[PDB]
Design an enzyme around this catalytic site. Sequence first.
Site, mmCIF file in Angstrom:
data_model
loop_
_atom_site.group_PDB
_atom_site.id
_atom_site.type_symbol
_atom_site.label_atom_id
_atom_site.label_comp_id
_atom_site.label_asym_id
_atom_site.label_seq_id
_atom_site.Cartn_x
_atom_site.Cartn_y
_atom_site.Cartn_z
ATOM 1 N N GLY A 45 51.754 -19.996 14.648
ATOM 2 C CA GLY A 45 51.658 -19.180 15.839
ATOM 3 C C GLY A 45 51.061 -19.868 17.049
ATOM 4 O O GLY A 45 50.794 -21.072 17.041
ATOM 5 N N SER A 46 50.855 -19.077 18.096
ATOM 6 C CA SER A 46 50.305 -19.564 19.359
ATOM 7 C C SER A 46 50.080 -18.427 20.343
ATOM 8 O O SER A 46 50.502 -17.290 20.112
ATOM 9 C CB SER A 46 51.241 -20.583 19.999
ATOM 10 O OG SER A 46 52.575 -20.120 19.935
ATOM 11 N N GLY A 47 49.422 -18.756 21.448
ATOM 12 C CA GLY A 47 49.108 -17.793 22.485
ATOM 13 C C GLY A 47 48.141 -18.418 23.461
ATOM 14 O O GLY A 47 47.320 -19.247 23.071
ATOM 15 N N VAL A 67 47.296 -23.254 19.645
ATOM 16 C CA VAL A 67 48.338 -23.211 18.638
ATOM 17 C C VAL A 67 47.697 -23.260 17.244
ATOM 18 O O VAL A 67 46.638 -23.854 17.057
ATOM 19 C CB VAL A 67 49.335 -24.350 18.811
ATOM 20 C CG1 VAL A 67 48.617 -25.689 18.759
ATOM 21 C CG2 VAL A 67 50.408 -24.265 17.737
ATOM 22 N N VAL A 68 48.326 -22.609 16.277
ATOM 23 C CA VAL A 68 47.807 -22.560 14.921
ATOM 24 C C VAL A 68 48.756 -23.279 13.981
ATOM 25 O O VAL A 68 49.946 -22.986 13.934
ATOM 26 C CB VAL A 68 47.683 -21.119 14.422
ATOM 27 C CG1 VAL A 68 47.141 -21.102 12.998
ATOM 28 C CG2 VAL A 68 46.804 -20.310 15.351
ATOM 29 N N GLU A 122 50.963 -8.951 9.140
ATOM 30 C CA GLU A 122 50.288 -7.792 9.733
ATOM 31 C C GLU A 122 50.311 -6.585 8.826
ATOM 32 O O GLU A 122 51.345 -6.231 8.290
ATOM 33 C CB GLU A 122 50.883 -7.428 11.095
ATOM 34 C CG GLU A 122 50.536 -8.448 12.160
ATOM 35 C CD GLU A 122 51.189 -8.171 13.514
ATOM 36 O OE1 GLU A 122 51.498 -6.988 13.805
ATOM 37 O OE2 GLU A 122 51.375 -9.143 14.289
ATOM 38 N N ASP A 154 38.305 -6.273 20.277
ATOM 39 C CA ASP A 154 39.735 -6.495 20.384
ATOM 40 C C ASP A 154 40.398 -6.053 19.094
ATOM 41 O O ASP A 154 41.275 -6.724 18.562
ATOM 42 C CB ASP A 154 40.023 -7.977 20.676
ATOM 43 C CG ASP A 154 41.442 -8.225 21.203
ATOM 44 O OD1 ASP A 154 42.144 -7.272 21.614
ATOM 45 O OD2 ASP A 154 41.851 -9.404 21.206
ATOM 46 N N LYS A 201 42.948 -4.076 17.179
ATOM 47 C CA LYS A 201 44.243 -3.475 17.397
ATOM 48 C C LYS A 201 45.116 -3.900 16.218
ATOM 49 O O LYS A 201 44.736 -4.797 15.468
ATOM 50 C CB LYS A 201 44.806 -3.952 18.727
ATOM 51 C CG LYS A 201 44.840 -5.446 18.868
ATOM 52 C CD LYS A 201 45.292 -5.832 20.242
ATOM 53 C CE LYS A 201 45.306 -7.324 20.398
ATOM 54 N NZ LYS A 201 45.728 -7.670 21.766
ATOM 55 N N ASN A 221 45.702 -7.500 14.955
ATOM 56 C CA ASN A 221 44.521 -8.190 14.427
ATOM 57 C C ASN A 221 44.049 -7.665 13.058
ATOM 58 O O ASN A 221 42.973 -7.994 12.586
ATOM 59 C CB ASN A 221 43.378 -8.114 15.437
ATOM 60 C CG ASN A 221 43.598 -9.017 16.623
ATOM 61 O OD1 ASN A 221 44.343 -9.983 16.540
ATOM 62 N ND2 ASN A 221 42.950 -8.708 17.734
ATOM 63 N N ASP A 229 40.794 -12.847 14.841
ATOM 64 C CA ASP A 229 40.699 -13.002 16.310
ATOM 65 C C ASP A 229 39.366 -12.565 16.971
ATOM 66 O O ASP A 229 39.282 -11.503 17.605
ATOM 67 C CB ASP A 229 41.888 -12.341 17.023
ATOM 68 C CG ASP A 229 43.218 -13.028 16.709
ATOM 69 O OD1 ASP A 229 43.296 -14.279 16.769
ATOM 70 O OD2 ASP A 229 44.201 -12.317 16.399
ATOM 71 N N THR A 269 43.718 -5.115 25.458
ATOM 72 C CA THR A 269 45.020 -4.504 25.605
ATOM 73 C C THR A 269 44.805 -3.048 26.005
ATOM 74 O O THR A 269 44.132 -2.293 25.296
ATOM 75 C CB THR A 269 45.798 -4.629 24.276
ATOM 76 O OG1 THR A 269 45.942 -6.019 23.955
ATOM 77 C CG2 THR A 269 47.175 -4.003 24.382
#
Length: 300
Positions: free
Chosen positions: A18-20, A24-25, A98, A137, A139, A142, A159, A178
Amino acid sequence: VFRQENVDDYYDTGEELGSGQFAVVKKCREKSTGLQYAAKFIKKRRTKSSRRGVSREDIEREVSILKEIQHPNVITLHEVYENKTDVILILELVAGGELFDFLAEKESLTEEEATEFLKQILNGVYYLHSLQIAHFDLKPENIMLLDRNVPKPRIKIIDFGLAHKIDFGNEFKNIFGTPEFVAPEIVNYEPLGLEADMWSIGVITYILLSGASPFLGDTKQETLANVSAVNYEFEDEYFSNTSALAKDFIRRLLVKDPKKRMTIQDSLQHPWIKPKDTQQALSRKACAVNMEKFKKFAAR
């Protein structure tokens, strides 16, 4: 501190998980034990005027928090490396995906079965909140599962990017997160504490049962206003087969005044989580998750 060595000397890295933003992971394997972890590469901003990475303060805070936490329902930090451009967190590999995507695959799910997973999140938050740590955070994205292919899957909250150790004697105010998941006090720039996580748990539970988002509107500003106004309905279309107990639980969480919001210790005592008589216990088995709509939700 952070080991100043080449992580490539100690780990083999491979696929991107993943990433954001500025991270990056990658999945990796420790050479000395052959064990698998997650390696998260976080770009340092380097100059203060730069908006192209993460400030050291923020990395320092997250790492310092991660260092403390030792609980089955939160990710664990293995190691930390640092090079010229990155800080590299070696994190417990959490590969179950998830929670919601895993729940969206069942045919049916009783409130009783729902509270099984929800209780795992509460236990994770109970621990954080017992150490005065606000996650800030929470949600659905996470809430991960460690491993999906076991009878009793374990929840891992991840996270800790926005998390803070609450400081007695200095109010913390900020805007972030969010919109559909943040408490009114975050929206209105009011003081922030452990209570904001409890609001978010209310939101999650509402979605878990309904497949519908409580405060989500047609625009960001509309969503922010719905939240600050605590404008939500248990719309009959979504909450047809949902118990009073479940609705009471959410109502005591979605409460504008933080001091009147249910606490983690209380939510664990709530009858819906911990039935105190046989009628309530059966109510839990009987009513269910609106799964048709819920699946639609997991569509995203």
